[PDB]
Amino acid sequence: GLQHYKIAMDPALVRLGSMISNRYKYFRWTKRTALVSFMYVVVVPSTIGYLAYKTDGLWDLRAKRRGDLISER
Amino acid sequence: MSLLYVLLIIPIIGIFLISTIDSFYFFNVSYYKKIALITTILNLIVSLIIYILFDFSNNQFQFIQENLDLSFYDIYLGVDGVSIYFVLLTTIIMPIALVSNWNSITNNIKSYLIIMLLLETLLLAVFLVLDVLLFYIFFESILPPLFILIGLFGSSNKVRASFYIFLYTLLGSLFLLLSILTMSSIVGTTYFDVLLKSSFEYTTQLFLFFGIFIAFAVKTPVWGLNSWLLRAHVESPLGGSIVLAAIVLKLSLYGVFRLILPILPQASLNLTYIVYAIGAITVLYASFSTLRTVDVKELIAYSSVAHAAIYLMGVFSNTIQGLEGAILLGLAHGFVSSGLFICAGGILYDRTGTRLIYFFRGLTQIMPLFSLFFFILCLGNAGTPLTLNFVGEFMSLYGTLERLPIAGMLASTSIIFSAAYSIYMYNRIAFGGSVSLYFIDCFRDLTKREFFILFTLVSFTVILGIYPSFVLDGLHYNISSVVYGIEPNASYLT
Amino acid sequence: VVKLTYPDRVSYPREFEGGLERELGGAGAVRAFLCLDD
Amino acid sequence: PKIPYPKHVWSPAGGWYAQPANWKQNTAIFGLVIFGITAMVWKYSAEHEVRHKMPEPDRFYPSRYWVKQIKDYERAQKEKQ
Amino acid sequence: KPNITGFDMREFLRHTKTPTYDPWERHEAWRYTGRFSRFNRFKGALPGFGIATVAFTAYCVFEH
Amino acid sequence: MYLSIIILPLLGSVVSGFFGRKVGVSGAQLITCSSVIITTILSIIAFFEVGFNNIPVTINIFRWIDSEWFIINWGFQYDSLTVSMLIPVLIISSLVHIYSISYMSSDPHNQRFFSYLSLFTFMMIILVTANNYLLMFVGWEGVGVCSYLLVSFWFTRIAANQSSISAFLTNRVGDCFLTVGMFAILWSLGNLDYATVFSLAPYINSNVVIIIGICLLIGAMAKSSQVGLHVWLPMAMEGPTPVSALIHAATMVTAGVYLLMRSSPLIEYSSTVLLLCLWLGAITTVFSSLIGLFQQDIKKVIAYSTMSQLGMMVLSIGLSSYNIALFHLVNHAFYKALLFLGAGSVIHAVADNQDFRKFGGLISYLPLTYSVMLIASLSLVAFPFMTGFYSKDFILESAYGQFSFSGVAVYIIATIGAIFTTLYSVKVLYLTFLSNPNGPRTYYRLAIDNFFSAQAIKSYKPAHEGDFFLTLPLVILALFSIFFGFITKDIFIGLGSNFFVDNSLFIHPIHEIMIDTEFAVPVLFKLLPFIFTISFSVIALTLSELLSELVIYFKFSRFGYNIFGFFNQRFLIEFFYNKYITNLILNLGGQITKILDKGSIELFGPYGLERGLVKLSKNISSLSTSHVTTYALYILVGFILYLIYNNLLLDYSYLLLIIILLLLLMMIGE
Amino acid sequence: SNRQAALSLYRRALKLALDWTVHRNLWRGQALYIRSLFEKNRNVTDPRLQRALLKETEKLLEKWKHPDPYCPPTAPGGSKYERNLPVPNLEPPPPLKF
Amino acid sequence: QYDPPTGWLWGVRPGEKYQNEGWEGPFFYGFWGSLIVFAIAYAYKPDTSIQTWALEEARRRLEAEGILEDPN
Amino acid sequence: EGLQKVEVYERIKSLLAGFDKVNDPNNITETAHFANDLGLDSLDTVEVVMAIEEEFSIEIPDKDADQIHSVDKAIEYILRQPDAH
Numbered sequence A: 001g002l003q004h005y006k007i008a009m010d011p012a013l014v015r016l017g018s019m020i021s022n023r024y025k026y027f028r029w030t031k032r033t034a035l036v037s038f039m040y041v042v043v044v045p046s047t048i049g050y051l052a053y054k055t056d057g058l059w060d061l062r063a064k065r066r067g068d069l070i071s072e073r
Numbered sequence B: 001m002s003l004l005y006v007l008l009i010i011p012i013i014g015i016f017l018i019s020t021i022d023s024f025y026f027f028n029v030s031y032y033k034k035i036a037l038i039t040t041i042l043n044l045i046v047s048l049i050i051y052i053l054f055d056f057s058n059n060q061f062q063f064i065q066e067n068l069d070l071s072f073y074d075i076y077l078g079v080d081g082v083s084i085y086f087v088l089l090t091t092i093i094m095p096i097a098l099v100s101n102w103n104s105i106t107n108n109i110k111s112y113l114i115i116m117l118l119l120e121t122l123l124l125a126v127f128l129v130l131d132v133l134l135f136y137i138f139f140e141s142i143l144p145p146l147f148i149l150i151g152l153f154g155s156s157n158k159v160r161a162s163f164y165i166f167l168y169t170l171l172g173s174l175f176l177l178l179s180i181l182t183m184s185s186i187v188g189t190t191y192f193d194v195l196l197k198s199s200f201e202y203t204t205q206l207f208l209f210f211g212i213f214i215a216f217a218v219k220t221p222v223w224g225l226n227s228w229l230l231r232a233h234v235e236s237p238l239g240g241s242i243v244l245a246a247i248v249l250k251l252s253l254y255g256v257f258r259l260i261l262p263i264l265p266q267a268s269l270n271l272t273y274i275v276y277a278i279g280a281i282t283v284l285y286a287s288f289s290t291l292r293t294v295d296v297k298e299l300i301a302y303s304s305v306a307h308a309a310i311y312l313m314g315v316f317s318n319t320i321q322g323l324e325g326a327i328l329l330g331l332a333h334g335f336v337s338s339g340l341f342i343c344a345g346g347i348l349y350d351r352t353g354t355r356l357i358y359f360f361r362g363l364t365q366i367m368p369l370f371s372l373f374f375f376i377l378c379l380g381n382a383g384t385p386l387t388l389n390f391v392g393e394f395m396s397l398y399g400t401l402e403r404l405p406i407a408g409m410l411a412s413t414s415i416i417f418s419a420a421y422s423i424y425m426y427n428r429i430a431f432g433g434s435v436s437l438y439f440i441d442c443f444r445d446l447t448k449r450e451f452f453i454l455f456t457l458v459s460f461t462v463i464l465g466i467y468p469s470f471v472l473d474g475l476h477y478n479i480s481s482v483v484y485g486i487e488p489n490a491s492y493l494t
Numbered sequence C: 001v002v003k004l005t006y007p008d009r010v011s012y013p014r015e016f017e018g019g020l021e022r023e024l025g026g027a028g029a030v031r032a033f034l035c036l037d038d
Numbered sequence D: 001p002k003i004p005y006p007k008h009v010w011s012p013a014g015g016w017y018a019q020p021a022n023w024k025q026n027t028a029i030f031g032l033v034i035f036g037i038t039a040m041v042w043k044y045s046a047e048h049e050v051r052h053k054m055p056e057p058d059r060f061y062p063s064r065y066w067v068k069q070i071k072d073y074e075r076a077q078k079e080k081q
Numbered sequence E: 001k002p003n004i005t006g007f008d009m010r011e012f013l014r015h016t017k018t019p020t021y022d023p024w025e026r027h028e029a030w031r032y033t034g035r036f037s038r039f040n041r042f043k044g045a046l047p048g049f050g051i052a053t054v055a056f057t058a059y060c061v062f063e064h
Numbered sequence F: 001m002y003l004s005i006i007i008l009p010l011l012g013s014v015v016s017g018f019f020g021r022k023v024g025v026s027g028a029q030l031i032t033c034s035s036v037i038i039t040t041i042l043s044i045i046a047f048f049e050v051g052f053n054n055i056p057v058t059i060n061i062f063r064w065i066d067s068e069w070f071i072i073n074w075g076f077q078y079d080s081l082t083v084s085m086l087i088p089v090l091i092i093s094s095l096v097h098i099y100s101i102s103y104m105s106s107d108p109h110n111q112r113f114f115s116y117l118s119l120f121t122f123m124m125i126i127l128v129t130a131n132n133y134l135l136m137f138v139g140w141e142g143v144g145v146c147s148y149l150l151v152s153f154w155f156t157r158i159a160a161n162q163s164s165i166s167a168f169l170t171n172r173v174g175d176c177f178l179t180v181g182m183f184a185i186l187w188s189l190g191n192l193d194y195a196t197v198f199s200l201a202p203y204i205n206s207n208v209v210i211i212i213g214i215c216l217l218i219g220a221m222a223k224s225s226q227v228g229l230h231v232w233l234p235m236a237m238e239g240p241t242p243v244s245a246l247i248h249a250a251t252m253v254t255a256g257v258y259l260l261m262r263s264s265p266l267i268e269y270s271s272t273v274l275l276l277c278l279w280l281g282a283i284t285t286v287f288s289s290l291i292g293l294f295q296q297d298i299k300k301v302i303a304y305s306t307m308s309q310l311g312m313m314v315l316s317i318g319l320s321s322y323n324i325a326l327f328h329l330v331n332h333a334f335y336k337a338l339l340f341l342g343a344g345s346v347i348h349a350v351a352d353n354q355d356f357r358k359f360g361g362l363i364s365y366l367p368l369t370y371s372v373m374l375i376a377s378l379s380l381v382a383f384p385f386m387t388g389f390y391s392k393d394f395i396l397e398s399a400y401g402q403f404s405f406s407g408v409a410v411y412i413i414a415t416i417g418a419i420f421t422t423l424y425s426v427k428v429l430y431l432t433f434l435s436n437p438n439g440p441r442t443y444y445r446l447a448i449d450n451f452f453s454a455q456a457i458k459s460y461k462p463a464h465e466g467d468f469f470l471t472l473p474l475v476i477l478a479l480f481s482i483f484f485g486f487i488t489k490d491i492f493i494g495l496g497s498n499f500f501v502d503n504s505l506f507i508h509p510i511h512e513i514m515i516d517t518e519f520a521v522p523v524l525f526k527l528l529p530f531i532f533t534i535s536f537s538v539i540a541l542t543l544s545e546l547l548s549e550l551v552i553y554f555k556f557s558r559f560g561y562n563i564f565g566f567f568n569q570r571f572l573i574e575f576f577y578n579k580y581i582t583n584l585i586l587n588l589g590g591q592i593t594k595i596l597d598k599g600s601i602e603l604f605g606p607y608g609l610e611r612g613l614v615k616l617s618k619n620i621s622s623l624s625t626s627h628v629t630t631y632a633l634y635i636l637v638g639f640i641l642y643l644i645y646n647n648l649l650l651d652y653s654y655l656l657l658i659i660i661l662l663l664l665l666m667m668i669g670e
Numbered sequence G: 001s002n003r004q005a006a007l008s009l010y011r012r013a014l015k016l017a018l019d020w021t022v023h024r025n026l027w028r029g030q031a032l033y034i035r036s037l038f039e040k041n042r043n044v045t046d047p048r049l050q051r052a053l054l055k056e057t058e059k060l061l062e063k064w065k066h067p068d069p070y071c072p073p074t075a076p077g078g079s080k081y082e083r084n085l086p087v088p089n090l091e092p093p094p095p096l097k098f
Numbered sequence H: 001q002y003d004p005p006t007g008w009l010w011g012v013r014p015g016e017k018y019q020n021e022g023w024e025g026p027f028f029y030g031f032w033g034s035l036i037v038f039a040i041a042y043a044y045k046p047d048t049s050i051q052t053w054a055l056e057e058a059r060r061r062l063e064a065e066g067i068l069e070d071p072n
Numbered sequence I: 001e002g003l004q005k006v007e008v009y010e011r012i013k014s015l016l017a018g019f020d021k022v023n024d025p026n027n028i029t030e031t032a033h034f035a036n037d038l039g040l041d042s043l044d045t046v047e048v049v050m051a052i053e054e055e056f057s058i059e060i061p062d063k064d065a066d067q068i069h070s071v072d073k074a075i076e077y078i079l080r081q082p083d084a085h
């Protein structure tokens, strides 16, 4: 497109940026990549979701004064 | 005719004039670009006329036209406070989106202007339609122009980027279509007035939810389904990037106020912990991986994923504050993401031909006007007070905490992580040492074009931050209609 | 070591007329010392 | 010793050692607009400050001279017997 | 037991003193003389004490 | 007038920043300095207005946020606590401005610097004058943005860019907890205005007050640099010295203390937070007194001295004597600003060297600076009848005055922390002025002695004192450091004083310990800090001047080698933060980017469906050989499968297994 | 090799002495002692023992390293280092339009 | 010894002047002009917000109680 | 403005004059050599460059310190440094 100004393009940084862009073409299923993938995609969301279900509607703070309890349920 | 149909015809009339001017003169490309820009300004003047006349506390759709003739598919236009500000945002962005990319196109300029003038009509329609199949019709008519915008005027990885956006958006939106077709079968029409009266059985609602949420989760987008945006936004031209982030990412946000809050309430209530679990995860993961991104324009795109998650948890709060905060954070994202894309895709890429943060350092020393605006747009991305972005996040985060406290507590960590990446990007480009040594020759600072669109976008972000009541007074009564719940002494009055 | 050998309070708690219950918010609010145990 | 700097760089804050020869005239003009702006916010304060207790007649309180709520009070109190 | 280097920390600390002979002795002698003698360094460590002490005694003698 | 105090510093900032070219360095300095001088005068009047007459002032301009139950205004309240904070904020801001004309004279960018100074004063005014917690948060964030802008003023230096990241992000951690705490207030009471929150506080659920108080306290660590979130405050010494005098040691650091003092009508109804406030305070005093005694930078010592005094005020807040903490807050900003402006003056004289190991003599070369910093150091150690005597020594006897285990504990802890304060006060005053010269002759070579022949006209540079714009602030702050405590002891300490009787500082009759602190505390503990200061000061002077070998013996022992490096490295808190928190987050970002986003999400997604389907489609497409004989066989095969299915009444699922088997057989090559 | 290396270690061990002992008089006596230990080994020739005495010195420089060694102010690691670093390119921008 | 003020605003060297690219006309007159005209019009827009309506009724209910004084 | 040759020379002359390891204070000139003109050992010259480093508050890297074996080479180096006091 438009001519840009002159940049001393570092061959080392250019090939690094090329590496980051095409990296997916080389992902494999190992014992390690599965372990990290299972932790992040299943375990953490399932733990966050489980606490979300258990504590849902558990507490309300509006207008609650002394002698009342925060716990709805 | 109505005034909402004038909004649609003007961008169509501009398409006709660009196509026929060569038949009256070999005409310059500068003449094609003035036609497209004057056409977008007139749509913005009409839209400001509509907003002057608009009734801020009316439960009837306004500026409608008496059809009186019914067919299988018929266009029905109306405006409510829930949609007026989405229309205004579309009509303020499109003029800037054209001005921002005024010199950068160079080849196929008529085609470029025609696609944007066509996109403006299709994105305006999706907010104005009063049926849910008509909503789907325009919510998905934008996919052919965007496939060709990226392919003709995109960057190096454009072919894959354009295949990703089309196929993900096509796949995700075909689960929405199945849910819409089911509701039409049970009720006999998708016109909003008739659909909102109708109450579905819980099981139907729980399966209509599975299918509208699958569509919205792909189009939000959520963390494991955001690959299309990381490609689409970056490889898109500057102008396409501005539209896709500011206006297209908001179509799913406005689609919850129509397809979920009023017609599937029990499903939305009993499934919010699934939404919040996803929304929390996409707040954290998106933010952790925005810290390690080495492409600047892809660092702006990843930031959008984290913000969309705050406004998604806000739309699922069943609270007046989180619902209005969700609309405020979507309006706020429209201005700030536009500016950060203009900085990364339209100033750095214009002068260097690179997007790698390795090559940029100390840019404040030679470009002091760019660094001032760049700092303000980074602070708004970080949700600093005095910008509209803070108000939307605070209200979106409060309704999230009031609905299910724990998830809003994780979601509140966005205050530390949005700040982390925003300042880190800033300190590495504007600051971070002296002007880089990879710059062989000096770079000029902001042009009077670059300055005045950045100034305009920053001006909207700050003024609306000081007095958000410019937008809040319009949404109050209409937001009041999408809340589900009763209070024991305020209900069932005799 | 401080918990083993630290002084006891040397003066009795100061006593208020009526516990100042009105001036501190009424019966539905906490008040000051008023002829109680120690 | 002053740092060598590029002379094509335009900054709203001046840049590296920027003092115009009209600095005094421009500074005088900015002073008046500051004084004029701060004169409007003062008259806003006078008519919009809210007090729930008025000052004593003989007790030093220079607000007595420009705030309308006090001036309304002290003029009303200056009517007796 | 001793290291191959002749370094012993007990002997190192023994020499932490002012050496009797020093090749650099005269190059450093300016830091302990003149303005930098013991007296001169602490001559004015309490600036106003001398003026204040006699002045306060004048006020202190108010019985007469 | 009241709304004009707010407006003036803002206007001077805008002229200096966006119009520096038109006004120049001189015009920017004049407008910036004059606007904050005028604001200072109008604020001294407002102290007589509001405090001495008990007339709170309310002004609302327009609404900021308008919703259901949420109405937050651009409104300002002036009460006794507001005008109390405004005096140190605006006196120190005015003087640092005048000071900065001399200190930053040689710097290229003066308009940008002075613009940031006025921007900080405006934000600090917003923080103390707001009607509600959400507008106070605007000043809180604003002061944070201004501290980032001033720590990173020299953007070319990478160290400065790291230290400004620390200030910005360690304060965002506190902001997250205040945002949660303000959500709790809106959720419980429906609005976060001060009058609303305090009127209703006695009746709210006691556990709801726990949640708010803890969140208010956590947010208070970051800004007040308490031990949990304090790593940023010593790194903020990268910015120019006048920045460290106002923002990093006399105003912004106190905002956390102001937040608890303002929230007194609420956190008084939760004694659980009051224990946390108290122990938080005592830890930070010994944590930072120990560190400062082993530092070699003068600014680092004076930065760790400030955090020892901030720990004193938080101790007083948890002791439930807010007037005492407010008294210390105002008194400290006079002598901490003095020591920083005095240290800045010796850095200026000695060629920007900040290391004690290269400073010596200088007492005859900088007489005013030495005496003025002697003024400041005597009130820092609370020498009797100084300004700091009435504030710091009442916190100690009030801790013992609350005859509890926690009070006697903090008295012992704080007294030990005072011992180390006396140690590093001697270190600063001995090694910079009283010790033998430890730096090059260039600072000490005069013209009274001829070292040259043909260059006598120039080239001596012997550590001279600065000019009028430098010394004037130092003299004024010296007079404050001697007398301000005495002249205001009644307004704050008193015995039944009614200065804060507009509920700006609410003490609940249950928590009052004033009368016992006046009478119960024995004279020994009342006088105990004094003997310790006088005894240690002479002991450290002998070990630094007379017997200098002994400390060499300590650091050359393996026991003392570890003890010297432990406190020099700041309890290794920086070490464990980068290695286990900061680097952990950067690894987590990489693992998500490398293994999930660019890994399994594309493999179990578009890229794995692409490479899987293209392989499948080539295999099925290889069944089509354009042989009529083989196509005829296919039609018969597809005929028989239809006949079997619709005559054997097979379960439809048996068909789907066939299709999935068939499709996956074409998925395998060869 | 093996000479500037032993002279770098000689300058280094004299800086570590002044870093721990802040007083120059006292470090002066320490400085004469470290010389004696280098001057005690001015007739070592075989590389088997030559490099062992450098390897074991490098251990004593780490064993007694200062937590905060002194750095001159304008030096890398110093307080005013990189403070107002000039633009490395003062030539006007080449004439291109964006 | 302060230096003269310097720089090229918009990159225009001290010789020549700013050359109008084409966008300037519509963007200054139409885009911004519409916003000032919208701003002046917005002042005379009648207030149809729910709160201005709800405040006035709310005052008439609390006036029927000792909470708010009535002018009658 | 900056450092002058006469200013740097007077300071190094007084530095080497006060060092007992120089053979004679008289034969210290701008072009004096440490090894033979002044008669200094391989360790005395390391001490000398440390004293020069202290005088000007600069740092001499090992690469640059090995080059300093004469007065003139030292004078040039101090003037090649825009960081000397």
Ligand SMILES: *P(=O)(O)OCC(C)(C)[C@H](O)C(=O)NCCC(=O)NCCSC(=O)CCCCCCCCCCCCC
Pocket: E005, E006, E007, G002, G003, G004, G006, G007, G009, G013, G014, G016, G017, G034, G037, G038, G039, G041, G042, G043, G044, G049, G050, G051, G053, G054, G057, G060, G061, G064, I041, I042, I043
């Ligand atoms: P000139 O050229 O005549 O001599 C220069 C040298 C000595 C390099 C000669 O060229 C030479 O003979 N080289 C051989 C080097 C060699 O093997 N031995 C010389 C001594 S090396 C050494 O390290 C000796 C021991 C020193 C021990 C003390 C230093 C460390 C103390 C601890 C740190 C400081 C206290 C905290």
Ligand SMILES: CCCCCCCCCCCCO[C@@H]1O[C@H](CO)[C@@H](O[C@H]2O[C@H](CO)[C@@H](O)[C@H](O)[C@H]2O)[C@H](O)[C@H]1O
Pocket: B019, B108, B110, B111, B112, B114, B115, B118, B144, B145, B148
């Ligand atoms: C549902 C289908 C998808 C719809 C998506 C929207 C597509 C919109 C495309 C715009 C219309 C085509 O745009 C058309 O581009 C061609 C490019 O060859 C132009 O044609 C001309 O282009 C340039 C103009 O200098 C000439 O050099 C070229 O020789 C000539 O062919 C037309 O003048 C323009 O009108």
Ligand SMILES: CCCCCCCCCCCCO[C@@H]1O[C@H](CO)[C@@H](O[C@H]2O[C@H](CO)[C@@H](O)[C@H](O)[C@H]2O)[C@H](O)[C@H]1O
Pocket: A059, A061, A069, A070, A071, B401, B405, F180, F183, F184, F207, F211
């Ligand atoms: C602001 C965001 C966060 C807000 C939402 C979180 C609020 C957390 C509230 C925790 C307290 C809820 O309410 C609390 O529940 C606990 C049990 O768990 C109970 O606690 C009870 O425990 C014992 C029995 O074990 C009782 O005899 C005692 O009276 C009481 O302390 C009470 O019911 C109440 O004190």
Ligand SMILES: CCCCCCCCCCCCO[C@@H]1O[C@H](CO)[C@@H](O[C@H]2O[C@H](CO)[C@@H](O)[C@H](O)[C@H]2O)[C@H](O)[C@H]1O
Pocket: B159, B160, B163, B164, B167, B168, B171, F605, F606, F607, F610
């Ligand atoms: C939920 C799961 C996913 C939902 C659906 C999303 C599916 C998206 C799949 C898109 C697959 C990519 O689509 C395919 O990409 C390759 C690039 O590698 C393109 O290939 C093109 O780009 C390459 C890049 O080197 C160039 O040589 C050339 O321009 C062309 O061959 C194909 O033209 C396109 O068809």
Ligand SMILES: CCCCCCCCCCCCO[C@@H]1O[C@H](CO)[C@@H](O[C@H]2O[C@H](CO)[C@@H](O)[C@H](O)[C@H]2O)[C@H](O)[C@H]1O
Pocket: A029, A041, B224, B225, F601, F603, F604, F605, F606, F608, F609, F611, F612, F613, F667
């Ligand atoms: C948050 C996650 C959201 C996911 C949403 C749904 C995404 C699409 C689901 C199916 C994706 C396709 O999944 C992918 O299929 C093809 C099958 O040929 C496989 O692709 C690969 O198989 C093996 C690797 O095991 C390779 O040797 C082979 O070259 C390649 O074809 C992958 O093993 C699988 O990961």
